[PDB]
Structure formats: C-alpha cells, structure tokens
mmCIF file of C-alpha atoms and ligand atoms in Angstrom:
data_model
loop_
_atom_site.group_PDB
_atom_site.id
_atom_site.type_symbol
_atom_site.label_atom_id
_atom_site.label_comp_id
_atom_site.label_asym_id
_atom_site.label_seq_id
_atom_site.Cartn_x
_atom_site.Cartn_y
_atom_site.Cartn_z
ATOM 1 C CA UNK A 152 144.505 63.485 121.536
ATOM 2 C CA UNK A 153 146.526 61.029 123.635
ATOM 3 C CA UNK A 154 143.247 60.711 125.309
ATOM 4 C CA UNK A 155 140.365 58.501 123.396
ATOM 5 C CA UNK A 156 136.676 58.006 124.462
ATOM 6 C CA UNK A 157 137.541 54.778 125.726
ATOM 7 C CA UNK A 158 139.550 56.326 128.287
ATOM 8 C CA UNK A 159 136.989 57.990 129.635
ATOM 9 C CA UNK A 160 134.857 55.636 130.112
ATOM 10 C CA UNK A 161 137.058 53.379 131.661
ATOM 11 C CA UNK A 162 138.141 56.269 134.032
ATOM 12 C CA UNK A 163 134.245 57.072 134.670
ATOM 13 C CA UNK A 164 133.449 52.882 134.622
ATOM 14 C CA UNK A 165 136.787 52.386 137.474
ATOM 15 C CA UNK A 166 135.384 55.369 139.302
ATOM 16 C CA UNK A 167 138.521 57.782 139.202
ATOM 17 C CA UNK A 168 136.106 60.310 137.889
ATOM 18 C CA UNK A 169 133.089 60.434 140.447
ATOM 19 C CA UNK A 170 131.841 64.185 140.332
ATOM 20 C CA UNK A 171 131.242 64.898 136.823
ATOM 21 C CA UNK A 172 129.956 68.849 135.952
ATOM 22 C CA UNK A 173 128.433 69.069 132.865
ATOM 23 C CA UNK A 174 127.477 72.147 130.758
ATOM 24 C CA UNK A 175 124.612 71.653 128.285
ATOM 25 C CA UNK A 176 123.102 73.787 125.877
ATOM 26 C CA UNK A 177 120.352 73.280 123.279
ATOM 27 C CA UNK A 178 122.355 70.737 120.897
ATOM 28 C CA UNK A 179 120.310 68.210 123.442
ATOM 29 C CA UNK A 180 116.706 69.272 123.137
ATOM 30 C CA UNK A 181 116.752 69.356 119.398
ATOM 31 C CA UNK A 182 115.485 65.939 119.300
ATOM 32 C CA UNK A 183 113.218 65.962 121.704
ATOM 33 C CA UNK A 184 111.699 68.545 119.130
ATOM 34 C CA UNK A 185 111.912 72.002 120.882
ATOM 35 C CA UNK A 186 111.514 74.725 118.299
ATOM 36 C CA UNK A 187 113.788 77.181 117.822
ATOM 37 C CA UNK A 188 111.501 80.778 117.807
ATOM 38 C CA UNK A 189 114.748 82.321 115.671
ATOM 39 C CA UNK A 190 114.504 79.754 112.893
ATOM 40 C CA UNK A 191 112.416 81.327 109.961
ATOM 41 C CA UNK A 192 110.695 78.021 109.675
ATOM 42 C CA UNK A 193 110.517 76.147 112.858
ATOM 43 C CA UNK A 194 106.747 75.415 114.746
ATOM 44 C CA UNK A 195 107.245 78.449 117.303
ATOM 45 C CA UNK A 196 108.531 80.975 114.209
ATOM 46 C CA UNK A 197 105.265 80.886 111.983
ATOM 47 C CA UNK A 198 102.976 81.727 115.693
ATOM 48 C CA UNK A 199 105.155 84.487 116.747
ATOM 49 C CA UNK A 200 104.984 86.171 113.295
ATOM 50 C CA UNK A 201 101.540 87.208 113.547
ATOM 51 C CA UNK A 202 102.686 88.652 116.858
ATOM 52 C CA UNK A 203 104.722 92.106 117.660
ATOM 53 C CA UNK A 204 108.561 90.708 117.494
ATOM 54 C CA UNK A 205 111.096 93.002 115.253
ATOM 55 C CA UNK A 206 113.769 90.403 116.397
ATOM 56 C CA UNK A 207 113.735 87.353 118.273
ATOM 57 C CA UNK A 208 115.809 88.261 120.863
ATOM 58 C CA UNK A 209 112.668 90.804 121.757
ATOM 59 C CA UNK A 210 110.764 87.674 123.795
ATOM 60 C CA UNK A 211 113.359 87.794 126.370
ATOM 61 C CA UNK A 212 114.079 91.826 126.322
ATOM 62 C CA UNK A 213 112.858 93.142 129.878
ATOM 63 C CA UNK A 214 111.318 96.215 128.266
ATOM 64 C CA UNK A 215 109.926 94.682 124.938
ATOM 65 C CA UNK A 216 107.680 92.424 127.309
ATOM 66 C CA UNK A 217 105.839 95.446 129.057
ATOM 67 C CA UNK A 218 104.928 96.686 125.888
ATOM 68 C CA UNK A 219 103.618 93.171 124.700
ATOM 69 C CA UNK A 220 104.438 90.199 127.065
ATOM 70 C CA UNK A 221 101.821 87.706 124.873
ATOM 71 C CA UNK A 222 104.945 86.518 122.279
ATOM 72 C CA UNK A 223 106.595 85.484 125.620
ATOM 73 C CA UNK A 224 103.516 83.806 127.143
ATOM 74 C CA UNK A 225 102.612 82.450 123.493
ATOM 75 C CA UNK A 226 106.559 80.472 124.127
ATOM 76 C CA UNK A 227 105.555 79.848 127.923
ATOM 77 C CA UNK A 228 102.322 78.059 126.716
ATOM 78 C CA UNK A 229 104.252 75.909 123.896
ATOM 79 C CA UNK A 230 106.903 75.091 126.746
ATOM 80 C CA UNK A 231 104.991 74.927 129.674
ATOM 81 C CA UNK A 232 105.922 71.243 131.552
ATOM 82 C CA UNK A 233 103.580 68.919 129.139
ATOM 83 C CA UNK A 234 104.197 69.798 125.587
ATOM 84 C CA UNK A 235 107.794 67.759 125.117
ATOM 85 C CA UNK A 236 109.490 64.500 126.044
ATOM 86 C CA UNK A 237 113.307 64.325 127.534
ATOM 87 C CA UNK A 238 114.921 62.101 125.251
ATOM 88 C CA UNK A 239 118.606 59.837 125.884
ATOM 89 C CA UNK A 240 120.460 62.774 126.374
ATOM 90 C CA UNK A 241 118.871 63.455 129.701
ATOM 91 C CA UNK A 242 118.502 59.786 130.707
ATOM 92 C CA UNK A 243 122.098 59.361 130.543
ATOM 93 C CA UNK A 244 122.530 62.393 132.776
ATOM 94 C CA UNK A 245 120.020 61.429 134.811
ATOM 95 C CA UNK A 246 121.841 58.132 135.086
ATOM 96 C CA UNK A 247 124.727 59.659 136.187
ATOM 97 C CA UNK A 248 123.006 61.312 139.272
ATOM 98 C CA UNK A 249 121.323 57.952 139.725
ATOM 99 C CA UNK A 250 125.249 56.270 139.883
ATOM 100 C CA UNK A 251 126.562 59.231 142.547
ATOM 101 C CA UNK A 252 128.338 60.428 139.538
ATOM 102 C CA UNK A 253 126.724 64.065 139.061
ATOM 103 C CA UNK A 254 128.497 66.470 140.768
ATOM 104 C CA UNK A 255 126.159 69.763 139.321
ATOM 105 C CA UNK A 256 124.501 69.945 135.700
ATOM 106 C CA UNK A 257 125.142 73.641 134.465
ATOM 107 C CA UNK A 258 122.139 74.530 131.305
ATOM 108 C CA UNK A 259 122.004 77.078 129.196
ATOM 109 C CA UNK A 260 118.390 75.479 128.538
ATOM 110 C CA UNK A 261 114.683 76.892 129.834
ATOM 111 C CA UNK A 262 112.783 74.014 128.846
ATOM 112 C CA UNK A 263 112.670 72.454 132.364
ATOM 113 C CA UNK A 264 113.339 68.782 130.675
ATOM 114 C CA UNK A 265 116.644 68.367 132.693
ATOM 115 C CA UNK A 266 114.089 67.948 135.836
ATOM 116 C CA UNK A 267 111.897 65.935 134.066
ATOM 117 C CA UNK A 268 114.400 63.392 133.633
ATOM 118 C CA UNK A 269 114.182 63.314 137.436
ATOM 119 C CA UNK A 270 117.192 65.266 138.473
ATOM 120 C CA UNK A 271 116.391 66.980 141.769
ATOM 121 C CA UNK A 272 116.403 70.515 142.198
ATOM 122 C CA UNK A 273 119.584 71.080 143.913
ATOM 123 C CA UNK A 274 121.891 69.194 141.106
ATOM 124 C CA UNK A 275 120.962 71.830 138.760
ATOM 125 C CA UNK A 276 122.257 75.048 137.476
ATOM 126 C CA UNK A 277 119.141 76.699 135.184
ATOM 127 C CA UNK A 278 121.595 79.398 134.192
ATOM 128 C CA UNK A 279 118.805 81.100 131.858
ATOM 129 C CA UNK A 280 116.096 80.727 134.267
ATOM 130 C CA UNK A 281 112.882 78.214 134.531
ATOM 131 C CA UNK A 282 109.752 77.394 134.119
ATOM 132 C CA UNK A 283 109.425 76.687 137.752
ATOM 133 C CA UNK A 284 108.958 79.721 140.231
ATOM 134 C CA UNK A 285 107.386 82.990 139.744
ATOM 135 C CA UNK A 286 108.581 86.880 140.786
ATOM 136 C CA UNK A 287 106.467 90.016 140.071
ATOM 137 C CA UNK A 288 107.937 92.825 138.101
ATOM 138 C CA UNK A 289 106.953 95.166 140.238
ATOM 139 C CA UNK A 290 106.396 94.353 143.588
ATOM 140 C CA UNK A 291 108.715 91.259 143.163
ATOM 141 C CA UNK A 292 106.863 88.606 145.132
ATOM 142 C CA UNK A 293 107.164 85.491 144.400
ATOM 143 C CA UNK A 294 104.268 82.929 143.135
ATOM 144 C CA UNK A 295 104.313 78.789 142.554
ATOM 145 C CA UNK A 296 104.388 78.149 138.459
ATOM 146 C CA UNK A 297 101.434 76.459 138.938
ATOM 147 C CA UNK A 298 99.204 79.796 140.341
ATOM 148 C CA UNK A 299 100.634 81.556 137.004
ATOM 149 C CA UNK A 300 100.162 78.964 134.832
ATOM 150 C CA UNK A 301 96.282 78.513 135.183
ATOM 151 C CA UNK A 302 96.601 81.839 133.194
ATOM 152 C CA UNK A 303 99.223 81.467 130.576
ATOM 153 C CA UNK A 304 97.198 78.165 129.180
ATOM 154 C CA UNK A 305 93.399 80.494 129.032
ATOM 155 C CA UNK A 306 95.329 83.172 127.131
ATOM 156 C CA UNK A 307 95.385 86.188 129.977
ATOM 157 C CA UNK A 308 98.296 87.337 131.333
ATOM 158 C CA UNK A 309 98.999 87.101 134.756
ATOM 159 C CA UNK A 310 98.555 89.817 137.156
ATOM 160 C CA UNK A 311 100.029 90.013 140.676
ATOM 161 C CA UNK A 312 96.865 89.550 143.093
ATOM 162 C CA UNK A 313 98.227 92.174 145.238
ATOM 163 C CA UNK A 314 100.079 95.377 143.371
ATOM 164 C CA UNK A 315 98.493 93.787 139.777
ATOM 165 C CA UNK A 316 102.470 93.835 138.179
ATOM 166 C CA UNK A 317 102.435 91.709 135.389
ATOM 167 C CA UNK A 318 103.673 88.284 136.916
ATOM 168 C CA UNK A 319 106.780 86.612 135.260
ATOM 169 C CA UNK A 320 108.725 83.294 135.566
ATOM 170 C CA UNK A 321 111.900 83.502 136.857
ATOM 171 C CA UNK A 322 113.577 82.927 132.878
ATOM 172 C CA UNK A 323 116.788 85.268 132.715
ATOM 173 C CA UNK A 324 115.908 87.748 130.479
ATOM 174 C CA UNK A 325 118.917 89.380 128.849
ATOM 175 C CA UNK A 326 120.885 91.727 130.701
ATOM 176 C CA UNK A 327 119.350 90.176 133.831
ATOM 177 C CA UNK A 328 121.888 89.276 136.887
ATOM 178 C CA UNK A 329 121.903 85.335 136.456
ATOM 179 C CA UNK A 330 120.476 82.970 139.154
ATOM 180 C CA UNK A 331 122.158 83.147 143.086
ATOM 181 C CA UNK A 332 122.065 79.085 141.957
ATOM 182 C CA UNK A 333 124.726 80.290 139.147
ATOM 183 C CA UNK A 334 126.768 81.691 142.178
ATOM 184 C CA UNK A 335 127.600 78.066 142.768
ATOM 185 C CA UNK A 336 130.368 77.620 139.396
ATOM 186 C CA UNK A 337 132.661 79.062 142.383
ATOM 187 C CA UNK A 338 132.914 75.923 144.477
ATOM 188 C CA UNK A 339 131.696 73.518 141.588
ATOM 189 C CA UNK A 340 134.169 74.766 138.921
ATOM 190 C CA UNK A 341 137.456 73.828 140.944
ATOM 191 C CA UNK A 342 136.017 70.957 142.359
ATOM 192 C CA UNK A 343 135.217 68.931 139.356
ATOM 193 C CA UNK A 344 137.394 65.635 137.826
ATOM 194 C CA UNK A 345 135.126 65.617 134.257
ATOM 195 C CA UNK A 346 134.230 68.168 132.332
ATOM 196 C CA UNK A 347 131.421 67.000 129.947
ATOM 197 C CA UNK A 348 129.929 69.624 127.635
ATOM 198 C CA UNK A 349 127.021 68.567 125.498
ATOM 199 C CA UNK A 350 125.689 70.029 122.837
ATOM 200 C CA UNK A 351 126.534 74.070 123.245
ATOM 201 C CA UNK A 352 127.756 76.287 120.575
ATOM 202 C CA UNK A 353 129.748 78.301 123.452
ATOM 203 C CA UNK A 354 129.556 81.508 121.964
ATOM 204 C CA UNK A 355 127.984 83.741 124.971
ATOM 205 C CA UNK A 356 130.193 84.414 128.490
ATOM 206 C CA UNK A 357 130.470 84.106 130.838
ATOM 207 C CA UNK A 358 129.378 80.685 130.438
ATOM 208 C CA UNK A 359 132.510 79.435 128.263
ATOM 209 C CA UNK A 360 135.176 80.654 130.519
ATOM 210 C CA UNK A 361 133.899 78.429 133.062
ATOM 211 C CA UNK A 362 135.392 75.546 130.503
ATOM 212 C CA UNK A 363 138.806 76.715 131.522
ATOM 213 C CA UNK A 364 137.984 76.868 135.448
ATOM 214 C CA UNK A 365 138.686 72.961 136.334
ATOM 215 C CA UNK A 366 141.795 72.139 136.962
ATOM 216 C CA UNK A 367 144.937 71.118 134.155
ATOM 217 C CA UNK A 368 144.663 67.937 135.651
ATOM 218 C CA UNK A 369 141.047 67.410 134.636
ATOM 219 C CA UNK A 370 140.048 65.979 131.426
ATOM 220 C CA UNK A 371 137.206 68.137 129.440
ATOM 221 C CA UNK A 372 135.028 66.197 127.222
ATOM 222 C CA UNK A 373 132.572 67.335 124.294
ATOM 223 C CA UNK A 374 129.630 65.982 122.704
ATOM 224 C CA UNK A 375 128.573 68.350 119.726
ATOM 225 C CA UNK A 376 128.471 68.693 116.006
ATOM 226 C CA UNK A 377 131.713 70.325 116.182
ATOM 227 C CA UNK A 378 135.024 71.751 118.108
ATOM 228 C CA UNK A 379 133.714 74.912 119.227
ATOM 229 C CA UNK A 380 134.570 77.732 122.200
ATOM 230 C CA UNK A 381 137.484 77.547 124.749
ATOM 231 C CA UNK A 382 138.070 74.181 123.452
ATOM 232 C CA UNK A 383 138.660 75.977 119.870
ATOM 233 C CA UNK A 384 140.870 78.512 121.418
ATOM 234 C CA UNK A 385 142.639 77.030 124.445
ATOM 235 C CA UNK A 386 142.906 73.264 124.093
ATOM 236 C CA UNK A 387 144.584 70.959 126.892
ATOM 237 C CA UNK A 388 146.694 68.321 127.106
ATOM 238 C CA UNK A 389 143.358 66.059 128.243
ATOM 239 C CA UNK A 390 140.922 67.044 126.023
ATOM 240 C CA UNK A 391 138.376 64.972 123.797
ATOM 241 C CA UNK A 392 135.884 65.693 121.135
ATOM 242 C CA UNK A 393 133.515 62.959 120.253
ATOM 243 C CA UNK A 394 132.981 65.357 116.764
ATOM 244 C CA UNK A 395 129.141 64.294 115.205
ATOM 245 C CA UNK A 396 125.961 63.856 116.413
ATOM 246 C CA UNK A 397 125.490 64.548 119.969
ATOM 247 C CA UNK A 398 122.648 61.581 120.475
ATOM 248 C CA UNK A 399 125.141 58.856 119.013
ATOM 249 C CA UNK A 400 128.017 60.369 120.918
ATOM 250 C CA UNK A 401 125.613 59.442 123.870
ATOM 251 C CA UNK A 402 124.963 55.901 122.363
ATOM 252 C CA UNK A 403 128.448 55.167 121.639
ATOM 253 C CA UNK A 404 129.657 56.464 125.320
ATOM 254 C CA UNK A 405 127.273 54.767 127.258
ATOM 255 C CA UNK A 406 128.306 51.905 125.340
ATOM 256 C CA UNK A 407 131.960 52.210 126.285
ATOM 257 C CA UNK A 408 130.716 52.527 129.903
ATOM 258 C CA UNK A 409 128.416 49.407 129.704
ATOM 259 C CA UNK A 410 125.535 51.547 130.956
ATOM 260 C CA UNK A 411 123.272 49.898 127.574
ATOM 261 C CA UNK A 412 120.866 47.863 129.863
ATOM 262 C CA UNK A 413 120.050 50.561 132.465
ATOM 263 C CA UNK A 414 119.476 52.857 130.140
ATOM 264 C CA UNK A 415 117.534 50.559 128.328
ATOM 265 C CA UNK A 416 115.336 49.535 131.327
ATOM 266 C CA UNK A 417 115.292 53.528 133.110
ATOM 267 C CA UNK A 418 114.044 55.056 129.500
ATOM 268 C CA UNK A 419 111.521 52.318 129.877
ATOM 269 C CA UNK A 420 110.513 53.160 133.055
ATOM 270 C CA UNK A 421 110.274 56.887 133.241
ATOM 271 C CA UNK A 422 107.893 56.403 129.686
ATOM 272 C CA UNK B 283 128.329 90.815 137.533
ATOM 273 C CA UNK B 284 127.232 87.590 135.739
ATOM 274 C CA UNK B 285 124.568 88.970 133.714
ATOM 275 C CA UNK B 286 122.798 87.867 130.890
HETATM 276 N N1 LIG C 1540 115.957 73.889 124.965
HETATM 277 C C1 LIG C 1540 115.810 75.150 125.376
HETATM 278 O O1 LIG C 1540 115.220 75.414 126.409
HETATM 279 C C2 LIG C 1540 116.391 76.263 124.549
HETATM 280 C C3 LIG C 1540 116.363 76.183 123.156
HETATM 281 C C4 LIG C 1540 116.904 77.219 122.405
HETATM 282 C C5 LIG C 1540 117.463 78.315 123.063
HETATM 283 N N2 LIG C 1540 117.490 78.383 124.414
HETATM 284 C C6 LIG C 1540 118.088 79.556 125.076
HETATM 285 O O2 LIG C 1540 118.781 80.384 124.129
HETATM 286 C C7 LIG C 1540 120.197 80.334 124.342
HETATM 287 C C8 LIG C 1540 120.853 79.315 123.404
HETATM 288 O O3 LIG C 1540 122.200 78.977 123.780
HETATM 289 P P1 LIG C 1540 122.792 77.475 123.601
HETATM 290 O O4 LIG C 1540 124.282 77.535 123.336
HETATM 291 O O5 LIG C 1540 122.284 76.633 124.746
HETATM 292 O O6 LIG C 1540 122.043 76.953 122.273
HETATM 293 P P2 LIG C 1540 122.502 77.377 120.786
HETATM 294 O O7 LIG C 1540 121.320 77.173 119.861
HETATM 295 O O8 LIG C 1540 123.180 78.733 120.834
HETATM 296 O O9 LIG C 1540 123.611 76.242 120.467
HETATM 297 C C9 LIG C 1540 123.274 74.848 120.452
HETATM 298 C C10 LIG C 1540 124.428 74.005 119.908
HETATM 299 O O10 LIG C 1540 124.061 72.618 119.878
HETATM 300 C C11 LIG C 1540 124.254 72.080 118.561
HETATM 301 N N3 LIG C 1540 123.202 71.094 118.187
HETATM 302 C C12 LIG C 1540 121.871 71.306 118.058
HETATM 303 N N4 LIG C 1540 121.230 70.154 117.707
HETATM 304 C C13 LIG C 1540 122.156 69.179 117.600
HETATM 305 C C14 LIG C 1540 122.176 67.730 117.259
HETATM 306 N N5 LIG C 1540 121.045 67.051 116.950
HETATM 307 N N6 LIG C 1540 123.380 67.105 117.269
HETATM 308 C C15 LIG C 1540 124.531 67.750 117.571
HETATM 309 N N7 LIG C 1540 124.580 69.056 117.891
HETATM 310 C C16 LIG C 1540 123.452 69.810 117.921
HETATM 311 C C17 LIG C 1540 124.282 73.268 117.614
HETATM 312 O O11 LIG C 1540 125.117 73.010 116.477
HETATM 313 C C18 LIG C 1540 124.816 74.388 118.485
HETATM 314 O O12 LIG C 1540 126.239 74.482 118.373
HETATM 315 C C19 LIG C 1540 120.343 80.003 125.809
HETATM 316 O O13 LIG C 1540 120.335 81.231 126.538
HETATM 317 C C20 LIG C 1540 119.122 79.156 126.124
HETATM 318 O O14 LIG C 1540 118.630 79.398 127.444
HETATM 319 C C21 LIG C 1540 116.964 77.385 125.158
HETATM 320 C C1 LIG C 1541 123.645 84.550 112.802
HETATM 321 C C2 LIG C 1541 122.275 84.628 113.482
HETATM 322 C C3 LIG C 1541 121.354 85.630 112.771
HETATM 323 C C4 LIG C 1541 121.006 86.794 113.709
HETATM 324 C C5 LIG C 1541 122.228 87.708 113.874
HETATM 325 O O1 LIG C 1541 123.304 87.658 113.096
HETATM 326 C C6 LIG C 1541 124.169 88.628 113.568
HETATM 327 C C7 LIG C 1541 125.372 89.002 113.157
HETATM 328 C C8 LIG C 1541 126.056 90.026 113.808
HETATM 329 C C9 LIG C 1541 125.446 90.637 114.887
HETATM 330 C C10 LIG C 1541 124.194 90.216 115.280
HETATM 331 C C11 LIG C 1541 123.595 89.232 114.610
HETATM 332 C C12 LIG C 1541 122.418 88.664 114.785
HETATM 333 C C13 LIG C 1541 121.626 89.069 115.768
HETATM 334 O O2 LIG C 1541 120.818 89.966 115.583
HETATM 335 C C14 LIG C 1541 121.927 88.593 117.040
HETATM 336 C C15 LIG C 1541 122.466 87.321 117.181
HETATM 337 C C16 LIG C 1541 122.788 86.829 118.428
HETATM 338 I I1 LIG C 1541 123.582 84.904 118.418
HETATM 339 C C17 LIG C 1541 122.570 87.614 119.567
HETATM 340 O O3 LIG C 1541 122.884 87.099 120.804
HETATM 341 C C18 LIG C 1541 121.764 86.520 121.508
HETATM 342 C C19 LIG C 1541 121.623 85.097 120.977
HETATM 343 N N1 LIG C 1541 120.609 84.255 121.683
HETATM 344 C C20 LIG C 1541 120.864 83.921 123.081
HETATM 345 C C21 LIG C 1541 122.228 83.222 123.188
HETATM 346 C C22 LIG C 1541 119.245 84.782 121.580
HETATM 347 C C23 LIG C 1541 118.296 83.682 121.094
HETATM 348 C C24 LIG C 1541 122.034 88.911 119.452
HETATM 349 I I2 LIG C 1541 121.672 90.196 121.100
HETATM 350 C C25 LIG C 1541 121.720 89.386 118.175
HETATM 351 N N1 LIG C 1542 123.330 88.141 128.702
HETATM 352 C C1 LIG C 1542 123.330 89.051 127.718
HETATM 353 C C2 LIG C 1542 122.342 90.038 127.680
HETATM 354 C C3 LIG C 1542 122.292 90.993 126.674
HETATM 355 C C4 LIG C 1542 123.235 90.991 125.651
HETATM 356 C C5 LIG C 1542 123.170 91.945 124.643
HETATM 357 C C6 LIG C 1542 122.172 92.915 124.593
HETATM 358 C C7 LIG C 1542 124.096 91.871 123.633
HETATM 359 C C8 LIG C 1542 125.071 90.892 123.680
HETATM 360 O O1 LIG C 1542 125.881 90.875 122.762
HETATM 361 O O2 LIG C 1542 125.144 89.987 124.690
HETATM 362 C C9 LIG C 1542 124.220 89.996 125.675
HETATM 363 C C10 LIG C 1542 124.275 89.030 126.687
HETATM 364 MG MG1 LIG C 1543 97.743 85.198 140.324
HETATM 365 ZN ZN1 LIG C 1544 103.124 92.452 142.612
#
C-alpha cells in the first residue's frame, strides 16, 4: 500500500491524526497469559472439564448459567482484577490517552486489563461486558463488583440480598443487547482520523462493520497475525497491515513514533 | 439491535 508504517507514525508524531479509535480483541491479552477456556489444553480448559460445559460457548449462555452458573464464576474467580498483568500492548494505548491522542478504545475483551493500564472509564467501549458492575437476573438491581466478589473468591454464588436472584456481572452474555456505552460507535465511528485494530480475528458483527464506518479519507491500520475481516473483503486506498506478531508490531510502531523512552519509563512506573 |  502507498501507505507504509512510517507514515503513520509521522502523521500520528506531526499530530494530523489526534483522535485515534481503536478496536481490540484478544490477539493483545495472549501475552499477558489469559487462557483461552475453548483451547483443549489451556490453564482454564483442564478446571472447567470437571465442571458441567457440553461446549464452551455454554459459560456465557443466559440459560446454561441458571442451571449451573459455577463454570462461569470458576472464569470470574481466575479473571477477577488480580490474577493477570497488562502487558505493552495496553501501555502503548494507555500512552496514547496519556498524549490526548485516544479518541475511544472499542474491546471485544472482558478481562478488565484495558483499565488497569489506567484508562479511565469513559474512554472505553467494554463491548462484551466487565468485570466491574453488577445487575441481578431477576430483580435487576444493580451491585458494586466488589459486594459480589467477596463471594465468587469463597466459592458461593452470589445471591441478591433482596429478591435472592442469582447476582451477575454485567459480561454480555450471547444474545444479550450490548452495552448503552456501545451506543456510542454512532458519534465515535464518523468522527475518527485513525483506525487502529489490534489483535482481532473480526469474525463476529456487528463489530467488523464498524471497520468500514470512518470515513474514505481515514487511514485504517492493523496489528495482527494476519489480514483478516473488512480489511480482507473491502480494502481502501489508505490501508496498512503491519502482518506478524502483534507485540513487535507495537515495538516497531512506537519506535517509528519515538515513544521508546516513555514507554520505557510509564511500564516502569505502573509495575 | 446490537446484540451479542
Ligand atoms: N482477554 C479476554 O478478556 C478474552 C479472551 C478470549 C475471549 N474473549 C471473548 O471472546 C470473544 C473473542 O473475540 P476476539 O476477536 O476478541 O478474540 P478471538 O480469540 O476471536 O481472536 C483473537 C485474534 O488475535 C490473534 N492473536 C492472538 N494472540 C496473538 C499474538 N500473540 N500475536 C498476534 N496475534 C494474536 C488471533 O490470531 C486472533 O485472530 C469476545 O467476545 C471476547 O469478549 C475475551
Ligand atoms: C473452529 C472452532 C471450533 C468450534 C466450532 O467450529 C465450528 C464450525 C462451524 C460451526 C460452529 C463451530 C464451532 C462452534 O461450535 C462455534 C464456534 C464459534 I467461533 C461460535 O461463535 C462464538 C465464538 N466465541 C465468541 C466470539 C465464543 C468463545 C459458536 I456460537 C460456535
Ligand atoms: N452475539 C451473538 C450471540 C449469539 C450467537 C449465536 C447463538 C450464534 C451466532 O452465530 O452468533 C451469535 C452472536
Ligand atoms: Mg450480596
Ligand atoms: Zn434481585
């Protein structure tokens, strides 16, 4: 593409581009070592085996969880805030909020990590939910993490004090209306000079399509093992694939930038 | 509409 990695740096390091929406998915947390629950083989896999789950996708069924919710709060426990470092990948987005850069961060993630790297609240988009803020299943109010958490770690599950529903975290759990937050790719979409999409297969909508709602003008960059989604289907005339490793896409970008320093000393601090 |  006429349009190198260079380029965008230099765009990003002149400030031309100055409110940057990027779309991540779980190509990022691999190496902060989150386990993937499918994967016959990963840490969560083996734990979830001795429990009642014909298919993985059961964990986040709506019905599958009132029958046995404890393969769902067996996950909670192994990703509730504690177990896992952020690692470069959300430094250097962090970075960008730190530089006035970040315009929103969209995630497909639910391991809260994005937030540890200090975002704040309102520059995210947890499109599949967090491990934040509570909602009962029945009676629907809502409950700090932290009151439903004291459970999850002692092995009961949670009970609304009031109508006794079994209490759940606000995760999107599928076929679940997504966040009012997500409500926001309306203004954010259209008003965005970089598109930066890292690490995401882009199989599932809607959140691909939203690849194609910037504007022709705007350049759409991706950091991923390979050329996947609306970038695969409907290129542009300003897009870029830094193909490989998404970490060393990071390192080599930042790089380009001249950001090596800052995110040498910030990594140092936040640790 | 946008579901999960
Ligand atoms: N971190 C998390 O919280 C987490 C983890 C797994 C799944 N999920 C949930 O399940 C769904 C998964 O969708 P998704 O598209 O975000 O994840 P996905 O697993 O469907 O796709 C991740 C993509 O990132 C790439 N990737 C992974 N590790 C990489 C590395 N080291 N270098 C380069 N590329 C790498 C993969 O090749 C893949 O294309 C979402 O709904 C999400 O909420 C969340
Ligand atoms: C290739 C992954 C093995 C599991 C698998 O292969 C299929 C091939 C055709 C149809 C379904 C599958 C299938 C699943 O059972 C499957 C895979 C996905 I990806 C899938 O979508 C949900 C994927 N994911 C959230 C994005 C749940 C972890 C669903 I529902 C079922
Ligand atoms: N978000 C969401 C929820 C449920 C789904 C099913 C059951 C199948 C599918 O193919 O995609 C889904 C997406
Ligand atoms: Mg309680
Ligand atoms: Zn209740």
């Amino acid at each position: 593409g006429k349009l190198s990695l260079q380029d965008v740096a230099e765009l990003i390091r002149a400030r031309a581009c100055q409110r940057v929406v990027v779309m991540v998915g779980a190509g990022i947390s691999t190496p902060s070592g989150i386990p993937d629950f499918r994967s016959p083989g990963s840490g969560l896999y083996s734990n979830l085996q001795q429990y009642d789950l014909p298919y993985p996708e059961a964990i986040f069924e709506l019905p599958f969880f009132f029958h046995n919710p404890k393969p769902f709060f067996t996950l909670a426990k192994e990703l509730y805030p504690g177990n896992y470092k952020p690692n470069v990948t959300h430094y250097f987005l962090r970075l960008l909020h730190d530089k006035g850069l970040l315009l929103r961060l969209y995630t497909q993630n639910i391991d809260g990590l994005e937030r540890v790297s200090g975002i704040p609240a309102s520059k995210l988009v947890e499109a599949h939910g967090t491990f934040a803020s509570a909602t009962c299943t029945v009676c629907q109010r809502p409950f700090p993490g932290e009151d439903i958490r004291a459970d999850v770690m002692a092995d009961r599950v949670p009970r609304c004090p009031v109508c006794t529903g079994v209490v759940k975290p606000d995760i999107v759990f599928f076929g679940e209306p997504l966040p009012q937050r997500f409500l926001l790719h309306v203004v954010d979409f259209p008003m965005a000079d970089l598109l930066l999409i890292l690490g995401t297969s882009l199989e599932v909508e809607p959140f691909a399509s939203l690849t194609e709602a910037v504007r022709s003008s705007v350049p759409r960059l991706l950091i991923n093992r390979d050329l996947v989604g609306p970038l695969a289907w409907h290129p542009r005339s300003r897009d870029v694939a830094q193909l490989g490793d998404v970490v060393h896409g990071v390192e080599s970008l930042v790089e380009l930038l001249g950001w090596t320093e800052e995110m040498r000393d910030l990594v140092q601090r936040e640790t | 509409r946008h579901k999960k």
